[PDB]
Design a protein around this ligand. Structure first.
Ligand SMILES: [Mg+2]
Ligand SMILES: [Zn+2]
Ligand SMILES: [Zn+2]
Lengths: 147, 140, 49, 42, 115, 391, 69, 184, 262, 32, 56
RNA sequence: CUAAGAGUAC
């Protein structure tokens, strides 16, 4: 999950060659769906991606405090001064054919957390196993091979 | 095989609309005063401007010989002769409506893979058009 | 970096959650429902420390 | 750990973020479940 | 846990071959060839070099699932031209182009002095 | 599992990873996301239970819900957006991509359709390629607002004998709507053919979108200078009208609407003016958004978002409401100690005149926090009460 | 914990550019961006790899070792 | 902060000035010889005050000093703010970003988010994985999860260096692309 | 006759060149092979003898696996999976041993320069960790307080970037074609003007700008790809490109071989 | 800066916060 | 309500769900482990002797 | 093993 409530599981993992790549060969560490942006209105996710891009390029640290006088215009201007598209879009190439994508991809560093909820600790199946002593039903919980 | 229809139109309006590769043109026939055309053309691939004289033909097939789609499209081999060789811009579609505009005027609607065309005129020269597949051929 | 402010009970770190309660020695008046014969109720939860 | 050490629990419209919560408890920090609003963080 | 070994992407499994051909009955003179332990890298290359052929009517490929490294390539040629022959010619053309490129790049790198 | 469609018979496909995998469409009946959701799998232990499960509870048999005599599944998320991008008139596909998209349809008859354009370059339109997915023999004719038999706006939908004659394919056509493509296909050809149609459409559209790409970024939430100036002018005009209404109320010249008090009418008028202000600002922003705007594209496709999302992200977040009323005076006669007593101005009572692009002031941030708190509380209370009512 | 060997995205070996980075920051009084450019980190993937690393290992090295020989 | 009449300037101003800030900076730098100046010194000379929700009913607070204290071509990209057209302030917020809690002080640009998303992140950063203590090697706790390479955020807040977040980060800077790439 | 190359910049680790008269599919296939199909040597198996450090055993094993190793003659090695030895031998592996002790009162940095090859390399040019910096110390593998000791052994097999990214000798591969967007393969997102808002690439200087009046050239295909390959250090960047071409040729040759033998 | 009694800016208040957290800490209420 | 109207049952699994555009509408992806755990009893028939014998 | 409690996921 990002620092903006953008929780989600890994749908699939692609190697470096299959990922879309910019003209500088950078491939993303993550690909997130655009559809999470309009409904959830996590604009701060986009703004912090842009600010992180500017900070990584310029070597400074993004001042992402809530109520500062930091604007998207200033971050965009600083990014344009660094040789990139001001709004964070980058012309990317499809990793399977190399052809340019007809649409330019929003691209940049972003701060993500790995949460404690892993699939290895939630998968659970039981064809047959221990039963309950009282009602002769399967016991409860995956910690007991329950049903 | 043979041309179901042929005429020379002059384009009075070219409307880009919300598109960058397709424009809708309205054309008035310079020979018959009652025939008129509305047509979606790929301007990227065949530019069209206002007051441009276009020879417009509709055929049932492109081969020079008479008829003997259901057969798969195959890229034209070198040296293959078709009616398209005489024209610059050739599209293929199916007719999907024959509207009776007036007592003598009828309109025929063709759908060129989503590029819409409506050709209207007196039935004495549009009668050859029928509810089937047709090729639209255009030269400047 | 450890900040303290917690207990060690049987080798487990136990923290006391700040329990919220109504303040004492404050007079609070509340409107009651129409069916009840009382329309307003003024109360104090008096206590001496 | 820090949020736990600064956690407040309200025994049980107390769930609403009151105006008086300004600057004394976090405006948006509370569980999504049945504890929403009852558990607050300073 | 359930994550399979990485080497299964590029290593041939027991009892299966790199190539398998099944004739396609939808159109005449058409085959579907399943390439095993491959990916888009070979797929797009072979597709393009098949489409450069004049006598190949249809040539396309698809990776049916990203989980498994394998892809299906359908080839339909003109009558009197075995689609296997089209695959042979496309592979030959790819090899020749790559060899010419390797020679050219070697000769171009030998021309540098600041290396 | 609130209804019978939330419990359906599927076919096992064994996969080499640790999660259940299901089609994107079939998530709509289950109300299932992929942000940590868990699902249950029951295996029948006899041929009889197996058989009646496959013949009564099969997913294709549940496509059309008895709940509203309309399909409960449709094309959603990326595919939906992709299909809108694929069926535009501008969308023309070269020979190689056409061959790949045709091969990606498992039941493609094996004949390449004659291209929509033959000279000087063979180009297939997106509608032509998508018509391969639609089964042969389907007739559909929907007329959108203002469409004619010719489509200047390419809206509407006309499909004749399985070929899309015209119309942009979007939520109204392939979505879970009555009379749409899903309903017509399942009622004419059968549930199996409808499931096959789902698979074919998703396959072709997802391939096209993979090789076309669709993104969204911060620039998609930005309106140009004149539009921002007009939005600010709209907000200022609304605030001036609110100030005039406040004057007329405070000068006692305001008359209470029949059936309510003076304060109730005043609050009603203020809330209405602020709501229509946010609506006008959002409409200005939406009109300003070009057709290439990614959020606009998603909204037009119907896959995700709406007008209000664009309004809040680009133009104005709007009025924050608690219990259906404006932000209440939690402190004595004032909402916060940062406002003087008896201040009924829009900013003092939760109106958020700043978009999410511009960011929120501290007071507006707190008022939005209160609004979201009410939203979460209402969500919990509503799910509990609805569960009890359903049982 | 300790500087990663390779940049996560591209894979440029940046585990050998941490002590040089610290020496540049300390002895030469260079700011972060100029030092990153000096070390050869031109892509912002590598620049974020080296810029935002937190050297926790120093902390771990303050405690007396559990097994001391 | 405490605000007094300040007849010398003729307008309301914070009781804290640049001299006290300089002394606090000197004390901090000495920690990182002059007379020590701590928060108790501000509390003792009437520089700062403690106000609770009972007293907070009868005060007026300035959100920021630079824009609300002085008496009255602007950047269109800046968010819209109001002046409140009133000068009767009694106290000043030390910083508005201090209304957030420990978990919500980690959010970058929380004012650029929908409030339920901020609540979700506040409840979700407690589930975040990082370094809970530097002496985890000598603690026999029941469960511990530690990132290999915790990175301090590229977009960092001013309130997260009091939480030692930069010392003990709970996440990584991943290069994210927002794209409908494969449908997965 | 065939693809033509003209290299702009030649460096020890970066080659920037132009790949003309070639199809897009071939250029992208070469790029992908260079990314993930070049065999390379990296530490694969780790036997931990002593570890009194603060880092976990598999943490240090992870760091060791990411150490680049010289792979000039990696084609002379064999894969351990198709070798006749029991676990690992000299014909299919290189054995290193990292032995460090914290005998200094200050922190002692265990670098990759202390990695010493144990197996006799039989005259090859493999095994050596790649050193790039001027100080001469390699990658900072670990740190030692006074009295801490870390003894371990590594078996290094040949590996490709597909099986694990630690074997990737490619780093970032810049790949671009048609900088002026003459093929119209992109629709430039813009607010007021696409030309102004999109910075011109450095490669725009190597092509003629469009005349702004000429009709769209629908017969124009994709060629003249500007490609910049970076070298991690395992193999020289020119050898990176050459081995990518070789491996792609080998893949197509294997396709032909299987086809002909069946 | 040069003026001892000049008004402070919005950046200055952070110093004050720092001083506060130098004396209180994050769990000062528990210990107190 | 706890043991008769609704009861804990065997032959059931539960885990996280992920999307897959390459699956049919009526298909569900089952992890290999869950397939290895959940079982179906198939009666031995002359028509399925070979495959069940091979599974054994 | 049972019971109670706390936190948490959708
Ligand atoms: Mg969910
Ligand atoms: Zn990098
Ligand atoms: Zn061996």
């Amino acid at each position: 999950a990002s620092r903006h409530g953008q929780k989600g599981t890994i749908g699939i993992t692609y190697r470096r060659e299959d990922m879309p790549f910019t003209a500088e060969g950078i491939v993303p560490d993550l690909i997130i769906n655009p559809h999470a942006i309009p409904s959830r209105m996590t604009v701060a996710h986009l703004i912090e991606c842009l600010l992180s891009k500017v900070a990584a390029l310029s070597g400074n640290e993004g001042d992402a405090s809530p109520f500062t006088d930091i604007t998207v215009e200033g971050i965009s201007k600083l990014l344009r001064e660094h040789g990139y598209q001001s709004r964070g879009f980058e012309v990317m190439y499809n990793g399977h054919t190399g052809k340019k994508l007809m649409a330019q991809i929003f691209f940049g560093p972003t701060y993500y957390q790995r949460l404690r909820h892993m699939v290895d600790d939630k998968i659970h199946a039981r064809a047959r196993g221990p039963m309950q002593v009282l009602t002769r039903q399967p016991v409860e919980g995956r910690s007991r091979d329950g049903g | 095989s043979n041309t179901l229809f042929d005429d020379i139109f002059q384009v009075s309006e070219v409307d880009p609309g919300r598109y960058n590769k397709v424009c809708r043109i309205e054309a008035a026939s310079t020979t018959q005063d009652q025939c008129k055309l509305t047509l979606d053309i790929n301007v990227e691939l065949f530019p069209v401007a206002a007051q441009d004289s276009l020879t417009v033909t509709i055929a049932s097939s492109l081969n020079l010989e008479d008829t003997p789609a259901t057969r798969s499209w195959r890229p034209p081999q070198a040296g293959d002769r078709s009616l398209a060789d005489d024209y610059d811009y050739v599209m293929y579609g199916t007719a999907y409506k024959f509207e009776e505009v007036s007592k003598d005027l009828i309109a025929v609607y063709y759908s060129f893979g989503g590029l819409l065309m409506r050709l209207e005129g007196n039935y004495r020269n549009l009668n050859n058009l029928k509810q089937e597949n047709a090729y639209l051929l255009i030269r400047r | 970096f450890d900040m303290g402010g917690y207990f060690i009970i049987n080798g487990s770190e136990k923290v006391l959650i700040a329990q919220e309660r109504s303040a004492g020695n404050i007079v609070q008046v509340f409107k009651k429902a129409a069916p009840s014969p009382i329309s307003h109720v003024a109360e104090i939860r008096s206590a001496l420390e | 750990t820090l949020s736990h050490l600064r956690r407040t629990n309200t025994p049980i419209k107390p769930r609403q973020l009151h105006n008086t919560h300004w600057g004394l408890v976090c405006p948006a920090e509370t569980p999504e479940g049945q504890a929403c609003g009852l558990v607050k963080n300073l | 846990m359930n994550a399979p070994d990485r080497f299964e992407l590029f290593l041939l499994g027991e009892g299966e071959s790199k190539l398998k051909i099944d004739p396609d009955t939808k159109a005449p003179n058409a085959v579907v060839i399943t390439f095993e332990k491959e990916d888009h890298t070979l797929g797009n290359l072979i597709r393009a070099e098949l489409l450069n052929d004049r006598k190949v009517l249809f040539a396309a490929y698809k990776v049916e699932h990203p989980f498994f490294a394998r892809f299906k390539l359908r080839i339909q040629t003109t009558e009197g031209y075995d689609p296997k022959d089209a695959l042979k010619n496309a592979c030959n053309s790819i090899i020749n182009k790559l060899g010419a490129l390797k020679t050219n790049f070697e000769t171009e790198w030998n021309l540098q002095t600041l290396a | 599992s609130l209804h019978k469609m939330s419990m359906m018979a599927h076919r096992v496909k064994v996969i080499p990873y640790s999660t259940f995998r299901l089609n994107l469409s079939v998530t709509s009946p289950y109300n299932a996301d992929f942000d940590g959701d868990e699902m249950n799998l029951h295996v029948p232990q006899s041929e009889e239970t197996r058989a009646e499960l496959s013949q009564l509870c099969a997913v294709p048999l549940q496509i059309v819900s008895p709940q509203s005599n309309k399909p409960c599944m449709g094309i959603v998320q990326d595919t939906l957006c992709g299909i809108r991008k694929l069926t535009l008139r501008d969308t023309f596909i070269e020979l190689d991509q056409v061959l790949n998209m045709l091969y990606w349809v498992p039941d493609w008859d094996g004949v390449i359709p004659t291209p929509a354009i033959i000279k000087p370059k063979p180009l297939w339109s997106g509608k032509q390629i998508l018509s391969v997915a639609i089964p042969n023999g389907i007739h559909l004719q929907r007329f959108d607002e203002g469409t004619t038999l010719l489509s200047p706006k390419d809206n509407g939908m006309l499909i004749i004998d399985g070929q899309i004659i015209f119309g942009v394919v979007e939520k109204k056509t392939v979505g879970s709507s009555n009379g749409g493509l899903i309903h017509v296909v399942t009622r004419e050809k059968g549930p199996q053919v409808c499931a096959k149609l789902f698979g074919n459409i998703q396959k072709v559209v997802n391939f096209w979108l993979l090789h076309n790409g669709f993104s969204t970024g911060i620039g998609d939430t930005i309106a140009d200078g004149p539009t921002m100036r007009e939005i600010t002018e709209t907000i200022a005009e609304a605030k001036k009208k609110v100030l005039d209404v406040t004057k007329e109320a405070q000068a006692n010249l305001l008359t209470a609407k029949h059936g309510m008090t003076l304060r109730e009418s005043f609050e009603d008028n203020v809330v209405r003016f602020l709501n229509e202000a946010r609506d006008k600002a959002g409409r200005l922003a939406e009109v300003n958004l070009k057709d290439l705007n990614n959020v606009k594209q998603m909204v037009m496709a119907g896959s995700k978002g709406s007008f209000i999302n664009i309004a809040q992200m680009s133009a104005c977040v709007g009025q924050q409401s608690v219990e259906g009323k404006r932000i209440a005076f939690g402190f004595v006669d004032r909402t916060l100690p940062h406002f003087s007593k008896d201040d009924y101005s829009p900013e003092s009572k939760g109106f958020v005149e700043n978009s999410y692009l511009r960011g929120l002031t501290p007071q507006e941030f707190f008022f939005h926090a209160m609004g979201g708190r009410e939203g979460l509380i209402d969500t919990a209370v509503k799910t509990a009460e609805t569960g009890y009512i359903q049982r | 914990m300790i500087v990663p060997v390779r940049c996560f995205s591209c894979g440029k070996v940046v585990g050998d550019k941490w002590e040089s980075y610290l020496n540049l920051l300390q002895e030469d009084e260079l700011d972060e961006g100029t030092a990153l450019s000096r070390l050869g980190l031109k892509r912002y993937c590598c620049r974020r790899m080296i810029l935002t690393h937190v050297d926790l290992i120093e902390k771990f090295l303050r405690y007396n070792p559990l097994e001391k020989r | 902060f405490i605000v007094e009449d300040d007849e010398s300037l003729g307008h309301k101003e914070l009781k804290v000035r640049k001299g006290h800030i300089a002394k606090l900076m000197a004390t901090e730098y000495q920690d990182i010889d002059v007379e020590e100046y701590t928060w108790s010194s501000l509390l003792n000379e009437g520089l700062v005050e403690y106000i609770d929700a009972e007293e907070e009913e009868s005060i007026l607070i300035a959100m920021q000093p630079e824009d609300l204290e002085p008496a009255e071509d602007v950047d269109p990209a800046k968010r819209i703010r109001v002046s409140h057209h009133a000068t009767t302030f009694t106290h000043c917020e030390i910083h508005p970003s201090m209304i957030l809690g420990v978990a919500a002080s980690i959010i970058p640009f929380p004012d650029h988010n929908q409030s339920p998303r901020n609540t979700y992140q506040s409840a979700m950063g407690k589930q975040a994985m990082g370094v809970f203590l530097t002496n985890y090697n000598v603690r026999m706790d029941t469960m511990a999860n530690i990132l290999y390479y915790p990175q301090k955020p590229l977009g960092t807040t001013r309130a997260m260096e009091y939480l030692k977040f930069r010392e003990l980060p709970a996440g990584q800077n991943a290069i994210v692309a927002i794209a409908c790439y494969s449908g997965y | 006759e065939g693809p033509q190359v003209k290299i702009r910049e030649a460096s020890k680790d970066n080659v920037d060149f132009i790949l003309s008269n070639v199809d897009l599919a071939m250029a992208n296939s070469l790029r992908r092979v260079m990314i993930a199909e070049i065999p390379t040597l990296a530490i694969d198996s780790v036997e931990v003898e002593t570890n009194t450090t603060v880092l976990a055993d598999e943490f240090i094993a992870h760091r060791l696996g990411l150490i680049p190793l010289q792979s000039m003659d990696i084609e002379q090695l064999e894969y351990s999976r198709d070798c006749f030895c029991e676990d690992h031998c000299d014909k299919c592996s290189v054995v290193l041993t990292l032995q460090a002790f914290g005998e200094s009162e200050s922190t002692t940095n265990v670098y990759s320069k202390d990695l010493v090859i144990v197996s006799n390399l039989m005259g090859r040019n493999i095994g050596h960790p790649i050193i790039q910096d001027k100080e001469g110390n390699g990658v900072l593998i670990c740190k030692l307080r006074k009295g801490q000791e870390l003894k371990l052994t590594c078996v290094a097999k040949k590996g490709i970037a597909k099986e694990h990214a630690k074997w990737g000798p490619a780093a970032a591969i810049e790949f671009e074609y048609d900088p002026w967007n003459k093929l119209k393969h992109t629709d430039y997102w813009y607010e007021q003007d696409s030309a102004k808002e999109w910075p011109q690439s450095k490669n725009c200087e190597y092509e003629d700008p469009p005349n702004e009046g000429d009709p769209f050239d629908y017969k124009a295909q994709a060629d003249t790809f500007y490609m910049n390959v970076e070298s991690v250090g395992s193999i020289p960047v020119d050898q990176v490109v050459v081995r990518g071409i070789d491996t792609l040729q080998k893949k197509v040759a294997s396709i032909l071989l299987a086809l002909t033998q069946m | 800066f040069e003026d001892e009694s000049a008004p402070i800016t919005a950046e200055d208040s952070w110093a004050v916060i720092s001083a506060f957290f130098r004396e209180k800490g994050l769990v000062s209420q528990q210990l107190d | 309500r706890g043991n008769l109207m609704g009861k804990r049952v065997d032959f059931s699994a539960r885990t996280v769900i992920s999307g897959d555009p390459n699956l049919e509408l009526d298909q569900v992806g089952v992890p290999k482990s869950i397939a290895k755990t959940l079982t179906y009893p198939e009666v031995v028939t002359p028509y399925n002797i070979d495959r069940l014998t091979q599974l054994v």
